[model samples]
Target: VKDTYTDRLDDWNGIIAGNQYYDSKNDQMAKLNQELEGKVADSLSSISSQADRIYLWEKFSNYKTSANLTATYRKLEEMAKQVTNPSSRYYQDETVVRTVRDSMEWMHKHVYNSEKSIVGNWADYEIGTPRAINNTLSLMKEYFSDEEIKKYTDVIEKFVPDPEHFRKTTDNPVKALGGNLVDMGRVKVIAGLLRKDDQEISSTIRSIEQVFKLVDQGEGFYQDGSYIDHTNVAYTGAYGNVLIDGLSQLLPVIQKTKNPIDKDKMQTMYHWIDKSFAPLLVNGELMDMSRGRSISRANSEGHVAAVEVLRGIHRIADMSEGETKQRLQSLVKTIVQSDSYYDVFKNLKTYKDISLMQSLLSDAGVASVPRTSYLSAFNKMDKTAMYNAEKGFGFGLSLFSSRTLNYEHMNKENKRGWYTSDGMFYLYNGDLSHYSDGYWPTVNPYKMPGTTETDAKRADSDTGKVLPSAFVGTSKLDDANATATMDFTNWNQTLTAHKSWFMLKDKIAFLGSNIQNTSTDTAATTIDQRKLESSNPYKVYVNDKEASLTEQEKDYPETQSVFLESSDSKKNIGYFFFKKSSISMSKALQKGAWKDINEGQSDKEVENEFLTISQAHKQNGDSYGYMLIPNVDRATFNQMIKELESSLIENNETLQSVYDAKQGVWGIVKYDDSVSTISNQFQVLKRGVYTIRKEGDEYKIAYYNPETQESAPDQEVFKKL
Candidate 1:
């Protein structure tokens, strides 16, 4: 059996297992979820215990071919790394290596419970499992062979047999409503194990194969793009964490493959790579963390997994030539086109401009160039990734955002704070007093201009600036002129190419009906003419006050106009602007899996319901006129007409009555010359804004009677007028 499963995986016909009973539904069926507890269980035990990784390479398929991964590895052979050398002050950037070891060790504890699991009782540490304990135990044992998995398997097997777990029995232990918690847990545990083992290199490859066998049995977990939740598509960047965990494990296995039989098996993992990992790439860019919510951060987990997969593809390309190499290179191009890589040039220009003033000792003299260690590292990384070559580091490492390398001015006083998320950052000199000069440039935004000589050096090396040109007036030169003179044409072109497609995804999210009418229209309005499909229904709120739109009788659909009407009266008429094509009534209903609202309700039942509307007539001077407001929907509208069809019972009193919210005119149902009472009123109105005077809690509505000329409604009535 292949350590990597998918290459020979029979092409699955959509046919899958039908519902069955006696499966493990879930683990610890009654426990509430806790991230804090999971974290406690997940953190590294001790870093000192494990530093070096022993892959014991079972095969080469584990590490996919990457463009620069080989280069990074190749560098190791030619140049002795200072940290790895063990002789330099900062031996072998050990922080990176240790972080990896710590991560694996942490997984060992939470996932396998190696030493901890030796005792008869496994701590009831609740790291949730969505499936059978055996499946989960199988995954753990694959990562690190442990006895605890078997013990828990026994405990759960005793509690509920496999068939019973999936059965429709009333007291199934593993089965839960709505979620296959047991299956999900199994997938995760298997993924964790695959992440740690040397797939083709060691006997553990067999364990990985067995894990896939379990996965094959559970293929029902992957639905028609829709998750078990049934509302969202799994491919909408939602199941990213699962793909990441599984692939990360699978990559190492492929990297170590040496056995001839494993070679064929490795294709199974790659096939999954093709199916699950590659779809999210939009022209090679990783997705932005947030689709566009301030509170929701970008999807970092997905981005990381994507980068790793791309790395695997790159690895495979390195060892092969001809068709395989060509195939991998194409994958590489996809990786680059994905917004996975950050534009370091933008950051570099920013740093040069913002930190330049400090780079000067006095107005006349340039300060001796700083050690440039941190900035140097960033620039060096930039060259390695080579943004110009169309090779990106993926979205995971935005040189500007990630605080991987710390910097301090050799002269203590000016240590910069660690870089924080959100891009709220500043770079300062050794003297704390020199901080940003508390200066704000009217023209330049975010940070100040660069006066640093390092900027000149970078320009001279990366571009073709001569030594004399490096001495050009620092602050004296026109700021815009300086920026324009810098050769970032490549950067601008790449950005343009990216925006052409990237903005489409943004357009899709805005118009989707699942989103509420909460977004501003300002950004949506500026979409390209080619991309403009439909007008979205959002209004911009400037400084908490809505930029109101005039509501007139003009039809909007023909004009391609969008407006935001607040769902709640207290809330301003809220709308989310979308491109003309962004919102299709069809797509909206499809995504929600909407069923016809009228599917089961009887037409008579719907028709019998009383209708509600506003009947406040505008004071159009002179003789009194009656206003009639229409009902809200087909259900309510039909009911209004039904009441009208019922013959007028001599000025029925019930017909004269109106709803409570808005006070409007009413007429009494006169039984005789002496007796009069209100009957249910017949009304019709369009949906729009209208004011009805409130009497106490109820706003009165006016009822009409054909018998009373004073109360008879005119044929035409406006919502307000």
Candidate 2:
């Protein structure tokens, strides 16, 4: 672009951007340019190795048509000298020399097949590097001379594209079908466009088509609309986000291409967007269980997938007139207008649907209304269920068994985190501040919300172990609600519990029975509510009276009922109910090293002051009932406590049953020949769990095997009075 490096020497040296970046007295333009230059320099320095340095240089030089600081320029000059001369140490690779630079001006050139770099062998190299190069080049004009462009074109002509890996393979079925293939195709598309190669273009188009085909054929998602990656983990926010971003990027590129990608493939992608991912955005944030390892990180990929889906809605011009498009556009508009969208506003810069996005900012000078009353159950693969109310209350329960995998990457932050899938329910009421406070990785893994585990220390080695039972399944009653039951048994640890969750419109009812700890350790069923210390001034109400956190912490308290409500009026409000057990409001300020919890990562000390309402049992056959009413005020919570008995009928260890008379639903773990008063004589034929719904003359019955975890066959039974 420039005649010589000396031509722009004055512009480079006078009031240079990086040198005066932090200065305040300069004009606004001067400050902006300086800050911009500083960012570019920092980005250039982030990479390691001469290969990466040259890679970024080739990409970045095209943008500004200039060099870097004095030291960086000297190093580049030295590297160029070695490449042009065989006597030099770096003169070994001709391809590297061509791709890096043709002459000292660092001309815009791309040499394909340069040290096996372009055809990325690994995911990061393939996707991240090419994306970096493509993004850098996007801001630049055609800066190279005709002669230089010709040389780069010649190199592109001889380049051979890399073969697809992990597709229809064993490494990871979900990733192979979703992100891996999509990213592989993206690299080819970028290279193809640069080279004007139709063959590579066609291959990329088909690769993208294969991605849709594989996804539709149950690759990344199961039949019940649960997204799973790397076998059986719920990864809607992990690999699902990757696939979403890749497809979102590819759709626009493919749309503008003279070569046509399949129209049906575009529609298939829309179907997945509408059904699998779009609905999971609860108040504009992705569900916590779907985020996986991101739960422990400094920044989570929360609701980014929803934003990507929104971007895809704008990119899928072919399907813009379709219903999925209109629905998602509405969803996105609602999201950007809601309070929850602020949590992920920084991540939304990738969304380029400015035209559609304007309506979200200010539509007709009127405020937008958020989504309400959405429920879904994903039980086929990941063994999870979710429900959200119209009143800004929602919960998700993640379960694990031999039939479904629980989590991925056991080492850092998620060590001994198997309890996440051990019938743990995450309750939400538009207050993610506690979860966002970096306390999750520091809390006791055993006392996860809605999980019943033996109170003990977990060894670092037991982090990745999967629960050894197939007794996890969900029974849906309607679109707005369902009941999830798990016959949990951790073989490595001698503990088992028959757990059931009644996911309702405003509340989640928990019932645990047949709880046993064969080992000589104290076992407890826990109902945990976590929050920040300042916002978490909570009171334990026993029989509608204020209870002390210090007094309840000494040992298990003798009480039939307990309520955990936030003292801070603005924070989350929860009411816990238990019958036929000595409930203890255990409060402790706990601290531990992050490495002790997450084994494979760096070690940092973490402290957590938590309150846990646990029902302790010394031996087997212990049971407890818990009802969590989220998003309620103190006055409303007190009233709800009085109505708990009439609202829920608890049969603690009496055949392990719970009846929600208002919903006309019944859940009972059918062992030991259980009978209830609703029927003249009610009975379970076999030893398992059954959830029945009354519909007129006939009753809808669903059965789940605790040990084998097989779906019970359809049957008709008559109850006699």
Top-TM-score structure, candidate number: 2
lDDT (Cα atoms) of all candidates against the true structure:
0.23, 0.55
Per-residue lDDT of candidate 1, residues 104-212 (tens digit): 3443333333232211111121112212222222322323244443433333233222321332222423332112322322333233333332331233233334322
Candidate 2 structure lDDT: 0.55
In candidate 1, stretches whose alpha carbon ends up further than 4 angstroms from where it belongs are: 1-88, 92-203, 210-261, 287-305, 319-321, 337-559, 562-721
Best by the lDDT measure: 2
Over all chains combined, what TM-score does candidate 2 have?
0.76
Q: Candidate 1: deviation at residue 409, Å?
A: 43
Model 2 residue 16 CA deviation (Å) reads 28
lDDT, candidate 2, at 60:
39
> Tens digits of per-residue lDDT for model 2 on 4-78?
222222122111111212223433333333433344344335423454344444333332222222223333323
Each prediction's total of clashing residue pairs, residues at least 3 apart in sequence or on different chains, is: 125, 1
